[PDB]
Amino acid sequence: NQVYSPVTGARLVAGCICLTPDKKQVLMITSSAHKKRWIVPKGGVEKDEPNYETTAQRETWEEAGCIGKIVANLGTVEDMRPGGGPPRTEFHFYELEIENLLDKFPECHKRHRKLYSYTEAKQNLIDAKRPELLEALNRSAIIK
């Protein structure tokens, strides 16, 4: 039920850089694969979905119980990895303004969630070994 690139054959994923009204803090969730690594909400595009905004906002709700307004398109980043060969993932990110953070959401028992300063969020994605996600974060309007 997943969607792949007709060029690279890379898996199409969409996610959100969820920033507060003041643009000081960003919403991070713990990885499911590894419980101590901090990432941002994102997930596979599905066949029915008409655009990437739909995937982004769906995954943002499921993984982080975040509701908000998409204010910007941060373009794409790739999971370019060791050796040669095409990327495995093509990520489409959007900046979202956090309107509401719900206590309950589909994966609130599988993950932790917390607002971080730019400084600490940058360290977390390094620690998490996800510089593609840090690229996307740096494209946002976060204060540093």
Ligand SMILES: O=P(O)(O)O[C@H]1[C@H](OP(=O)(O)O)[C@@H](OP(=O)(O)O)[C@H](OP(=O)(O)O)[C@@H](OP(=O)(O)O)[C@H]1OP(=O)(O)O
């Ligand atoms: O759908 P899968 O084939 O299981 O893909 C998983 C899944 O990615 P998605 O969220 O995009 O589905 C993991 O994310 P979780 O939802 O389990 O958190 C992600 O782990 P991260 O949490 O680090 O993103 C992991 O990537 P990794 O290679 O780091 O294990 C990735 O595997 P793929 O390489 O097959 O995409």
Ligand SMILES: [Mg+2]
């Ligand atoms: Mg996911």
